[PDB]
Amino acid sequence: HMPERFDAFICYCPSDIQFVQEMIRQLEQTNYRLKLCVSDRDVLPGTCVWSIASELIEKRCRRMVVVVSDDYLQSKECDFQTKFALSLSPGAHQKRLIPIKYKAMKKEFPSILRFITVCDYTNPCTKSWFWTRLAKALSLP
């Protein structure tokens, strides 16, 4: 059940959430004790999953997991996440939150991942380990 202490939060768009949730759920089930959150359960139909209120993120969640993808920017949902992710706190541009995507964005990028730690499938064939990089970066302590 929704505990009091969390690891990170998941900021994705309803354009390609299925893919994100797949990565997240696969990241939490890892060996290390990882606890990720999301916007809600309505986005993830089927069975109960790991979710949390957006108000408990800056209070409970320590880090954030942003998903900057073409189909994510085309929506306003990212615009809100940006203004909140860009102008969050004085010194948390890429220290707690980290952008990710299943491919390069053919359109413009938001003032969020201008050039920060971004995880894109450039060569998953070998870069596939990226799953561990984010899994270990979300639950380092």
PDB file of N, CA, C and O in Angstrom, residues 102-103 119-130:
ATOM      1  N   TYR A 102      12.060   6.641 -25.714  1.00  0.00           N
ATOM      2  CA  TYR A 102      12.265   5.426 -26.497  1.00  0.00           C
ATOM      3  C   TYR A 102      12.870   5.742 -27.865  1.00  0.00           C
ATOM      4  O   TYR A 102      13.055   4.848 -28.689  1.00  0.00           O
ATOM      5  N   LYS A 103      13.179   7.016 -28.101  1.00  0.00           N
ATOM      6  CA  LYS A 103      13.766   7.440 -29.368  1.00  0.00           C
ATOM      7  C   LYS A 103      13.935   8.956 -29.404  1.00  0.00           C
ATOM      8  O   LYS A 103      13.342   9.675 -28.600  1.00  0.00           O
ATOM      9  N   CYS A 119      18.378   9.468 -21.392  1.00  0.00           N
ATOM     10  CA  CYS A 119      18.515   8.066 -21.770  1.00  0.00           C
ATOM     11  C   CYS A 119      17.686   7.757 -23.013  1.00  0.00           C
ATOM     12  O   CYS A 119      16.472   7.569 -22.930  1.00  0.00           O
ATOM     13  N   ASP A 120      18.347   7.708 -24.165  1.00  0.00           N
ATOM     14  CA  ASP A 120      17.668   7.422 -25.425  1.00  0.00           C
ATOM     15  C   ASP A 120      18.234   6.166 -26.078  1.00  0.00           C
ATOM     16  O   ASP A 120      19.433   5.896 -25.992  1.00  0.00           O
ATOM     17  N   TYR A 121      17.366   5.402 -26.731  1.00  0.00           N
ATOM     18  CA  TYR A 121      17.782   4.175 -27.399  1.00  0.00           C
ATOM     19  C   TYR A 121      18.585   4.485 -28.654  1.00  0.00           C
ATOM     20  O   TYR A 121      18.051   4.484 -29.763  1.00  0.00           O
ATOM     21  N   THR A 122      19.875   4.736 -28.471  1.00  0.00           N
ATOM     22  CA  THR A 122      20.761   5.033 -29.589  1.00  0.00           C
ATOM     23  C   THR A 122      21.408   3.747 -30.086  1.00  0.00           C
ATOM     24  O   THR A 122      21.662   3.578 -31.278  1.00  0.00           O
ATOM     25  N   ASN A 123      21.652   2.841 -29.149  1.00  0.00           N
ATOM     26  CA  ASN A 123      22.250   1.552 -29.453  1.00  0.00           C
ATOM     27  C   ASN A 123      21.898   0.548 -28.357  1.00  0.00           C
ATOM     28  O   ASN A 123      22.780  -0.089 -27.782  1.00  0.00           O
ATOM     29  N   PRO A 124      20.592   0.398 -28.047  1.00  0.00           N
ATOM     30  CA  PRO A 124      20.127  -0.527 -27.013  1.00  0.00           C
ATOM     31  C   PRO A 124      20.836  -1.868 -27.084  1.00  0.00           C
ATOM     32  O   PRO A 124      21.049  -2.527 -26.069  1.00  0.00           O
ATOM     33  N   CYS A 125      21.201  -2.254 -28.299  1.00  0.00           N
ATOM     34  CA  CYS A 125      21.902  -3.518 -28.528  1.00  0.00           C
ATOM     35  C   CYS A 125      22.995  -3.725 -27.483  1.00  0.00           C
ATOM     36  O   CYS A 125      23.207  -4.835 -26.996  1.00  0.00           O
ATOM     37  N   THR A 126      23.673  -2.636 -27.135  1.00  0.00           N
ATOM     38  CA  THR A 126      24.735  -2.676 -26.138  1.00  0.00           C
ATOM     39  C   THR A 126      24.423  -1.733 -24.981  1.00  0.00           C
ATOM     40  O   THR A 126      24.789  -1.995 -23.834  1.00  0.00           O
ATOM     41  N   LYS A 127      23.734  -0.637 -25.288  1.00  0.00           N
ATOM     42  CA  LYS A 127      23.360   0.344 -24.279  1.00  0.00           C
ATOM     43  C   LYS A 127      22.204  -0.167 -23.416  1.00  0.00           C
ATOM     44  O   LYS A 127      21.799   0.492 -22.459  1.00  0.00           O
ATOM     45  N   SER A 128      21.667  -1.339 -23.767  1.00  0.00           N
ATOM     46  CA  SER A 128      20.552  -1.929 -23.031  1.00  0.00           C
ATOM     47  C   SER A 128      20.762  -1.837 -21.518  1.00  0.00           C
ATOM     48  O   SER A 128      19.800  -1.780 -20.753  1.00  0.00           O
ATOM     49  N   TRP A 129      22.024  -1.819 -21.096  1.00  0.00           N
ATOM     50  CA  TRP A 129      22.354  -1.730 -19.678  1.00  0.00           C
ATOM     51  C   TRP A 129      21.730  -0.488 -19.041  1.00  0.00           C
ATOM     52  O   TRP A 129      21.592  -0.413 -17.820  1.00  0.00           O
ATOM     53  N   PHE A 130      21.359   0.486 -19.872  1.00  0.00           N
ATOM     54  CA  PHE A 130      20.752   1.725 -19.387  1.00  0.00           C
ATOM     55  C   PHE A 130      19.678   1.443 -18.338  1.00  0.00           C
ATOM     56  O   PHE A 130      19.469   2.239 -17.423  1.00  0.00           O
TER      57      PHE A 130
END
